[PDB]
Amino acid sequence: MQARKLAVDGAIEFTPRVFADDRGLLILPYQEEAFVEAHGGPLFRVAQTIHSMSKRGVVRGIHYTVTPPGTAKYVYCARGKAMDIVIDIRVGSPTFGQWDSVLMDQQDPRAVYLPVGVGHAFVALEDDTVFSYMASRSYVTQDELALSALDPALGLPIDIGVEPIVSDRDRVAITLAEAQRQGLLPDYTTSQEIERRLTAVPVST
Amino acid sequence: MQARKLAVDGAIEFTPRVFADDRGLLILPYQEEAFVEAHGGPLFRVAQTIHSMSKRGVVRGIHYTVTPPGTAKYVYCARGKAMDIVIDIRVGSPTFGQWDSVLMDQQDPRAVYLPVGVGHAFVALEDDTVFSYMASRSYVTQDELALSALDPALGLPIDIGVEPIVSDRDRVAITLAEAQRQGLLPDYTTSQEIERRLTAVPVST
Numbered sequence A, B: 001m002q003a004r005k006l007a008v009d010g011a012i013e014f015t016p017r018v019f020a021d022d023r024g025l026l027i028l029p030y031q032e033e034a035f036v037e038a039h040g041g042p043l044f045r046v047a048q049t050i051h052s053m054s055k056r057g058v059v060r061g062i063h064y065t066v067t068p069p070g071t072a073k074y075v076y077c078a079r080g081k082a083m084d085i086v087i088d089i090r091v092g093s094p095t096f097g098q099w100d101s102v103l104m105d106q107q108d109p110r111a112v113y114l115p116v117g118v119g120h121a122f123v124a125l126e127d128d129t130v131f132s133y134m135a136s137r138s139y140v141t142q143d144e145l146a147l148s149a150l151d152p153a154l155g156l157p158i159d160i161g162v163e164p165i166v167s168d169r170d171r172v173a174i175t176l177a178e179a180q181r182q183g184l185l186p187d188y189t190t191s192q193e194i195e196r197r198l199t200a201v202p203v204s205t
Helices: A032-039 A174-181 A190-199 B033-037 B176-181 B190-198
Strands: A002-005 A012-015 A018-021 A026-027 A047-055 A059-063 A074-081 A083-086 A099-105 A111-114 A118-122 A129-135 A143-146 B001-006 B012-015 B016-021 B026-029 B046-054 B057-066 B074-079 B081-087 B099-103 B111-114 B120-123 B131-135 B142-144
Touching: A002 A032, A012 A032, A018 B016, A032 B111, A059 A083, A074 A083, A074 A099, A074 B046, A074 B131, A083 A111, A129 B074, A174 B190, B001 B033, B012 B033, B012 B099, B033 B111, B057 B081, B074 B081, B074 B099, B081 B111, B081 B131
Parallel strands: none
Antiparallel strands: A002 A012, A012 A111, A018 A026, A026 B046, A047 A129, A047 B026, A059 A118, A059 A143, A074 A111, A074 A129, A083 A099, A083 A118, B001 B012, B012 B111, B016 B026, B046 B131, B057 B120, B057 B142, B074 B111, B074 B131, B081 B099, B081 B120
């Protein structure tokens, strides 16, 4: 397993090996040793998992969780192809306003660690594109917020030639800039504090 | 989410709802509230995840982990169709020697909790059949052991009309009965003790 610290502070791309034989395929998308060495502590406790499949041209995001409580996530692309995007929406962050992209696909599969307080978006490049998540918190539509993924100030790499396929909620999302004005965005310090508590190393005999 | 306690003591089948819209599909295969209510405690901490894809007619198993240390698992079928099988190999168990099957498929997806000390096997009924696991322990070929899934004393539902597609290791696996003779099988009491420590409820303020 290879790990690559992304430009968005604390975000990480992991590249598992694909082991192939006569029976099919085996991948180990999350691996404790590689993760602890990259991040400094183990994965959060898993409160919920998500299986999401999208059609070609679907754009989902930018999604984030009111912080506190916040959510940290670990996502891998289990089928199809996507441009995955971490957006740093944590006010105070050294990389605030920065985004990073990971090409997710079945030939060179990738997993992404998303810190507490960051936004997540992606575009599906193929039908039957599947994102598989572990999350540190169960989903409350409540605390779950959206920002405009098509926002021109952002220039996210989300256009693939065809009309984006988007939920009404994601389509009408306020901008990053508007959310900051209104004080709706995660704070970087708070986010970090929660994240360190979530991914605390177990300390035993 | 629905939960169904299986005949193999402590094993559980969970039935998530499939939410479908214009964009594709969403499923929440592991959910803390449903799991704690069925099992009595939360999922183990996640040490590793597994993405496995199989061709039609592939039989994998019966696999188990030397106990101690043991491994507990949570598996959902993310693509295709399978007959999934929990085998109770814990000597002392009230359901020792019993197996249970879950039909895994994309139309009515299912997740299975596998306790510490139980064996796991399945047959893929379609090409591109994907099993997605969280496990309480990272994989050591070491502590990872196999029993004969085609064993006639077992009568597992693993034949689909065509020659089974099997690893050399799984093909040459000793029987359940032979493993017991040799003292290679998990102990039920020990398994339970480990399981309770793994899935201990967090107790905070």
